[model samples]
Target: DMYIERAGDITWEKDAEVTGNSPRLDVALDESGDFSLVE
Candidate 1:
């Protein structure tokens, strides 16, 4: 299971453009409080 919450008033619309025509990146976190930004 996973739960994603906003960071204190930070909101982004669905498919919202962030920069350079990139629609942002959706990250996933596991149950062990670990992120996917590493080896």
Candidate 2:
């Protein structure tokens, strides 16, 4: 399942357009022969 969260200062409606990747995924980048998560 897609784990999501809301900001403390923001309130969302019941029917909001929240989007995310299900099954959980990680974003990474490779540069100069190195790999790391997005910063």
Candidate 3:
């Protein structure tokens, strides 16, 4: 288990969750035009 946090303004304050070590993330755009993180 691990916790990732950021300290700064609230403009980009969204939470993400995953369960693993040495993780690789990919960002994808959908028809809704929102960027999402894909593992």
Q: Count the backbone clashes (under 3 Å) in each candidate.
A: 0, 0, 0
CA error at residue 28 for candidate 3, angstroms: 0.8
Write one digit per residue (lDDT tens) for candidate 2, span 1-38: 79988757766589988997775446565676665655
Over the stretch 1-39, how does candidate 1's per-residue lDDT look in tens digits? 999976686676899867766545566799999766433
Clash pairs, candidate 2, are none
- Return the top candidate by TM-score: 3
Score each candidate by Cα lDDT: 0.70, 0.68, 0.79
Compared with the true structure, model 2 gives a TM-score of: 0.24
Give me the displacement of residue 39 in model 2, in angstroms.
15
Highest lDDT against the true fold, candidate: 3
Cα RMSD for candidates in order? 9.8, 12.4, 13.1
| Candidate 3, 1-39: lDDT as tens digits | 999888777575368665678856689999999989876
Model 2 residue 20 CA deviation (Å) reads 1.6
